[PDB]
Amino acid sequence: AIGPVADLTISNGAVSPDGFSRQAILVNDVFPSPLITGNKGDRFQLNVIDNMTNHTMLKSTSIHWHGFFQHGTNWADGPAFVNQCPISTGHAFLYDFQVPDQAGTFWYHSHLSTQYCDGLRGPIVVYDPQDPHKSLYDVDDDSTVITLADWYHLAAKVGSPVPTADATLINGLGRSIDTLNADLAVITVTKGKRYRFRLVSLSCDPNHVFSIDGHSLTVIEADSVNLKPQTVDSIQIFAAQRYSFVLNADQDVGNYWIRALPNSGTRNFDGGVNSAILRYDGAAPVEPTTSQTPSTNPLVESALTTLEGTAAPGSPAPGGVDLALNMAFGFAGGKFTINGASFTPPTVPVLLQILSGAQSAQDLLPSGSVYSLPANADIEISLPATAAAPGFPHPFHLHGHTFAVVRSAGSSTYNYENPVYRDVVSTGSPGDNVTIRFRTDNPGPWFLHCHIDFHLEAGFAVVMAEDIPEVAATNPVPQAWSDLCPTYDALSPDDQ
Ligand SMILES: *[C@@H]1O[C@H](CO)[C@@H](O[C@@H]2O[C@H](CO)[C@@H](O[C@@H]3O[C@H](CO[C@H]4O[C@H](CO)[C@@H](O)[C@H](O)[C@@H]4O)[C@@H](O)[C@H](O)[C@@H]3O)[C@H](O)[C@H]2NC(C)=O)[C@H](O)[C@H]1NC(C)=O
Ligand SMILES: *[C@@H]1O[C@H](CO)[C@@H](O[C@@H]2O[C@H](CO)[C@@H](O)[C@H](O)[C@H]2NC(C)=O)[C@H](O)[C@H]1NC(C)=O
Numbered sequence: 001a002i003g004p005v006a007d008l009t010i011s012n013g014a015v016s017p018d019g020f021s022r023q024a025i026l027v028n029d030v031f032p033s034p035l036i037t038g039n040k041g042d043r044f045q046l047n048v049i050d051n052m053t054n055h056t057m058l059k060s061t062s063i064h065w066h067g068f069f070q071h072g073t074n075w076a077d078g079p080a081f082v083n084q085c086p087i088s089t090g091h092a093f094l095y096d097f098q099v100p101d102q103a104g105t106f107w108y109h110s111h112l113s114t115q116y117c118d119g120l121r122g123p124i125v126v127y128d129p130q131d132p133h134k135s136l137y138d139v140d141d142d143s144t145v146i147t148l149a150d151w152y153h154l155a156a157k158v159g160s161p162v163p164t165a166d167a168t169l170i171n172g173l174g175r176s177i178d179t180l181n182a183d184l185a186v187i188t189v190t191k192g193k194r195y196r197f198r199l200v201s202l203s204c205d206p207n208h209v210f211s212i213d214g215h216s217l218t219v220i221e222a223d224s225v226n227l228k229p230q231t232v233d234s235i236q237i238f239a240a241q242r243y244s245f246v247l248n249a250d251q252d253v254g255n256y257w258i259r260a261l262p263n264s265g266t267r268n269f270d271g272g273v274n275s276a277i278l279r280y281d282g283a284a285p286v287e288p289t290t291s292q293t294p295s296t297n298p299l300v301e302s303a304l305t306t307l308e309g310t311a312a313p314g315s316p317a318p319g320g321v322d323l324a325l326n327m328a329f330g331f332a333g334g335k336f337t338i339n340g341a342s343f344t345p346p347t348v349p350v351l352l353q354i355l356s357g358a359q360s361a362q363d364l365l366p367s368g369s370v371y372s373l374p375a376n377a378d379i380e381i382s383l384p385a386t387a388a389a390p391g392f393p394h395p396f397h398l399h400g401h402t403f404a405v406v407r408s409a410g411s412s413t414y415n416y417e418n419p420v421y422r423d424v425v426s427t428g429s430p431g432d433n434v435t436i437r438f439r440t441d442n443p444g445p446w447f448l449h450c451h452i453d454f455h456l457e458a459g460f461a462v463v464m465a466e467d468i469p470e471v472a473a474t475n476p477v478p479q480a481w482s483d484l485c486p487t488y489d490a491l492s493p494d495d496q
């Protein structure tokens with residue numbers, strides 16, 4: 001892997017991850033984007049050098065480091081027009097931040113429009129030298145990162161506004177229905193060894209039901225949060241989520257199908273679509289002939305708990321917090337709404353608005369989309385599922401924070417004692433009332449949005465303006481950040 005100090009050069013080029021070729025986005029001349037790693041406590045210095053020339057996929061860029069708290073470095077978080085203006089082509093920008101108090105599985109992706117769908121997205125691992133789960137496994141390295149991704153034959157701005165994927169990629173490879181002989185990813189294991197696999201969803205839209213024929217999976221991490229171990233036989237993973245699971249390679253030496261069934265597009269495994277190969281050392285170099293058995297032990301989010309058994313912030317009753325917010329989803333004029341407002345990117349990034357003197361949510365643009373949060377407070381947010389926002393279940397993501405999921409999708413119970421904490425949560429289907437809690441210990445504007453990128457583009461977002469009075473003092477910005485907007489605003493539209 002590369003990192004924690006590295007150049008990330010962004011360019012355009014042709015790729016063929018499902019045996020069909022198209023123009024896309026390369027990072028350090030490769031697709032899919034390379035793995036970046038560090039250790040707990042490391043300073044990351046990622047110099048993003050933008051050499052893109054294709055306006056259809058956008059020449060500008062901005063990168064989000066998904067899951068990092070960015071305390072004191074809100075300017076480095078990535079969302080275009082929230083935390084920065086985009087980097088302009090022919091320029092570079094250094095993201096310089098620390099990860100003092102976090103370890104686990106993360107990822108990076110463009111956070112400008114729908115650009116990450118065109119290929120700028122890759123995994124990150126922050127290792128913990130004192131990982132409490134470390135004695136459960138033998139192997140945890142580049143080879144044990146498993147990414148899932150949707151792939152489209154037409155680019156994000158070329159196809160339908162809400163497209164359906166032609167292929168699922170596993171570690172960057174997969175088959176489409178018209179490319180049944182395309183290359184497949186192979187993950188190799190040695191019989192008798194134990195592996196920490198780190199499963200990362202780079203998806204722009206679909207969720208995937210992940211399973212491995214003949215094997216159970218011991219889940220030990222969700223979205224960079226250590227869990228009490230939970231053995232499962234399938235995992236439904238939503239866009240932008242991560243899980244670590246331990247696999248004991250104790251079955252017969254052979255080839256076993258790795259499966260990732262999407263919730264849209266091709267919903268079968270015919271011809272080896274939506275599949276990869278688990279190969280034991282010594283097995284024949286052939287495709288598996290294993291069968292899928294019904295999942296009788298699927299992952300259930302409400303049954304997950306943190307390793308430390310951390311209580312939810314606040315008191316154990318509905319509304320037992322300093323500020324309770326309800327987000328009512330809707331859809332009007334082809335745009336998503338939250339509490340009647342659709343997010344449209346402001347000309348001046350929200351952070352720059354605050355640093356320039358905006359004092360309240362009413363002062364902040366876009367109007368109706370920004371919520372001021374008090375400092376050092378317990379917050380509860382409910383996000384009740386509704387068919388009024390098409391394309392459910394919507395996996396919501398809160399920047400700058402992990403949150404307690406006090407009520408999960410598909411469950412009527414509330415857990416304040418020992419709920420799972422994570423950073424992306426499915427808000428489920430009608431009848432659900434997914435409810436989250438967090439503490440406001442991190443001054444800055446933080447995006448809260450559906451991580452289905454096509455829905456974000458259609459306005460399905462709000463901004464949480466946390467502790468506005470302390471933002472400037474807590475987040476001193478580098479000169480290079482100050483220069484982003486004047487450079488970007490000087491571009492002609494066709495160079496954006
Ligand atoms: C930079 O970025 C872009 C995005 O990657 C590039 O866009 C490509 O540009 C061309 C047009 O110049 C496309 O080819 C066209 O595709 C359409 C649609 O094809 C599909 O749909 C039709 C109708 O349903 C169907 O008949 C076909 O079988 C396809 O399924 C065609 O109608 C056109 O005739 C033409 O073939 C590309 O599809 C497109 N690729 C990306 C992935 O969307 C662009 O080329 C880049 N510019 C630099 C110079 O390379
Ligand atoms: C889901 O969650 C919230 C919070 O429990 C609900 O909104 C609250 O519900 C009651 C009754 O209407 C009120 O006492 C409060 O004023 C509400 N608090 C929030 C901050 O507005 C809501 O009713 C639920 N929605 C789904 C449909 O069950």
Ligand SMILES: Cc1ccc(C(=O)O)cc1
Nearest residue numbers: 162331334390391392454
């Ligand atoms: C309007 C509309 C329709 C469908 C979707 C979707 O994601 O399926 C999103 C928006």
Ligand SMILES: [Ca+2]
Nearest residue numbers: 183184185186
């Ligand atoms: Ca091969």
Ligand SMILES: [Ca+2]
Nearest residue numbers: 143187188189
């Ligand atoms: Ca291996």
Ligand SMILES: [Ca+2]
Nearest residue numbers: 103104224225
């Ligand atoms: Ca962690």
Ligand SMILES: [Cu+2]
Nearest residue numbers: 064066109240
């Ligand atoms: Cu993300």
Ligand SMILES: [Cu+2]
Nearest residue numbers: 066067397399
């Ligand atoms: Cu994020």
Ligand SMILES: [Cu+2]
Nearest residue numbers: 394450452455
């Ligand atoms: Cu959505």
Ligand SMILES: [Cu+2]
Nearest residue numbers: 079397447449
């Ligand atoms: Cu985001």
